[PDB]
Amino acid sequence: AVSKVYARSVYDSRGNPTVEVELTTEKGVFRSIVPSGASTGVHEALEMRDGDKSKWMGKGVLHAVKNVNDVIAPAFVKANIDVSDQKAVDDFLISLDGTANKSKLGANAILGVSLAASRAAAAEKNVPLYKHLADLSKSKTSPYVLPVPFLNVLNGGSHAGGALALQEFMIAPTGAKTFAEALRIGSEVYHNLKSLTKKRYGASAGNVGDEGGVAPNIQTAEEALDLIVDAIKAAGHDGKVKIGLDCASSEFFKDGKYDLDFKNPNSDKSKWLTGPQLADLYHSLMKRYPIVSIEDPFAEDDWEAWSHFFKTAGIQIVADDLTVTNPKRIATAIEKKAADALLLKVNQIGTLSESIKAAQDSFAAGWGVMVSHRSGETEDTFIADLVVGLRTGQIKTGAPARSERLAKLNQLLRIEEELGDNAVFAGENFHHGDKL
Amino acid sequence: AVSKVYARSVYDSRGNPTVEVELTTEKGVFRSIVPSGASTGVHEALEMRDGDKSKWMGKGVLHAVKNVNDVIAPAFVKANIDVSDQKAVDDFLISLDGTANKSKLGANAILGVSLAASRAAAAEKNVPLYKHLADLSKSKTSPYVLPVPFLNVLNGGSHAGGALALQEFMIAPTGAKTFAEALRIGSEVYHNLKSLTKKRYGASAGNVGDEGGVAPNIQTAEEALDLIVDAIKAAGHDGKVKIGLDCASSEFFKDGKYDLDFKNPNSDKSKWLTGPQLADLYHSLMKRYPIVSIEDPFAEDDWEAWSHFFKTAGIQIVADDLTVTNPKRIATAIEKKAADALLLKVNQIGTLSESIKAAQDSFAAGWGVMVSHRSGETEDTFIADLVVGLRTGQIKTGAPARSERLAKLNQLLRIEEELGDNAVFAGENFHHGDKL
Ligand SMILES: [F-]
Ligand SMILES: [F-]
């Protein structure tokens, strides 16, 4: 029995405030802190800021805290809802809000009672969260699939100050044979990288980005892709490590052309490329590099470039800004075949239930699902248990640097070690981990 | 009753492995992850690496894990030691090691059973850790003193790739009237800073350092001090925020002269300054800036420059590398009056007990005590409770960025909120917080 829903403000990996919700049942205090991304696409549920320029650069969340303390809080103690009933929690919460983009109470306000309540059911069925999440989503359990961590080693978009356009160059130790091994390879590739970067580029090029990546002032893709290769060789893990891209293309989408130097700035549109020309750029890149995943190649609504691109892909296409963890918009991408992967962001939709629902819909259509963090993360380790919970096999939780990142990976070590023989690493089957 | 001491390897804020110890009593599993610094002075207890170039760049800690699992582990279940008995735990642990710099079992191996056992006593006396720590150290309790967080906003030493020599430029919101307020000011000064830096210096100068600080390629001190001022004005908190320095002078200590460009490199010794000349440098700096704390002005053994400097100080002098959290060496600094502040690093000495002892000895001599983190931190939030526990009033836990930092600050918000009227912020009495 839920006795007291409370919320307080706390800090996120980037120093901005966010919402922490403490749920108290007869079994203890369950907590959950809320992520915050900042690159984001249009169709994402709404995170409500204070807008008060005089406090926390007006990014405060004083209100959203209030939505929880004086509004949601009381309704709930009293609604005497059964926390095992994720759907019933979410549902009360959606209705409370009565809006479609959680703009009434603000998604930051809700996500939080959601997650928190999932931990309180866990404590109650007396099982680890991963198992809870396993139940909620009706996912196999024999083995659990520890995922290939897609580690963002060099950052170049909203994520870091530098001239680099594509936003994320991720390494994937899919060749590894256990989670602890993959994590060991990546750290290695990672460390090698810090060095080739501080060498070719300058002591300063070794400074990180928002997701703990290196932020060399590279310009073109090739230059950074070549940089990852070199450290992949340096490290001695050649063939065991694959690359992944996050073009975050919504961002240099203009006048119907994509600007690779959305910062030149006397950028020659004589250069701005059309959908089909970027289509060739990427093929060029794809044949020359151990590239297996490409996230948001085209902008959040350029459906034509996706479907076209997608048909001759031969690799995993991930929808971030195109589908914003919305069944609504997923439906469109399936129908239109804009892709085959769903980057899942809990805070993009606001409730546990709608997200689990985002994943089912994706799985029934043959898509894979990479569970993600945000540029602005907290010490909360929930994605760790949800990635295992959903049995997808791919998680984007950043570089092996900056602890709002490691807290997730360190959590994954603990699950693996815990499960024993009852867990298998997706490995080369990252893509179809669910039903593996 | 202690039933099973286990250890596993996990990752630190910088991606290197470290030791995680799980202690299990009849009340649950207590955990603790071990910090790791990397700048460090000579006289620090020993952190034992694997030395195996082929795994984790040979920074693995496969052994140290083994010291705990097959050696310390068994002795302990059986020694049936009363975890309320910190001293008895530590003591068994020291003796097990039989060495003076914990070089036999490695300090990373021990710290860990120590901390972990302190959390298991807490769970057992049925009180929050801060209160436990309060007991262990016989410290007042009516009010508790939340400390002024010394936030490292611009980094320039081992901590970050750039030309800057002094290692840390810290802001201190000592004017604030509560912990949550100080934390709010600093975030503000901080954010303002990210901007003046990306402006004057370049998108790249906005990338952080090891402690989440900004790493502009500044050269001189003045330039960076002026940069903090500007954001202090920008932010609108003028007079409410003080500056703190970490010269980390052991590092550019050479031929008996200090090299401000320990990277020039055709550095003119015609420039290398003697103890008394740096003495003037700092006065220059001190009269021109809201400087209240200076950590390691002189190298770890240049006792003469400390005592000399110290006499005309008029401000707080902090011993990091000079005293390496060692009563032994503190004794020397008191006698010799090399200072009046003790940067306390639990991992520098290896046991909870010797650290608490480091603090008493410091307090009895009139010194203050700033509790510190390390360049390589974890999601563990123990320093948070020890800073409150010892009632010192000053903590160095990094910038409001990168969650291995925020996990401590976010923890401090929770204590304040928790204690109610039973807590007071050291404020302007940072220095003598203990007996306030
Ligand atoms: F993303
Ligand atoms: F330090």
Ligand SMILES: [Mg+2]
């Ligand atoms: Mg993305």
Ligand SMILES: [Mg+2]
């Ligand atoms: Mg220091």
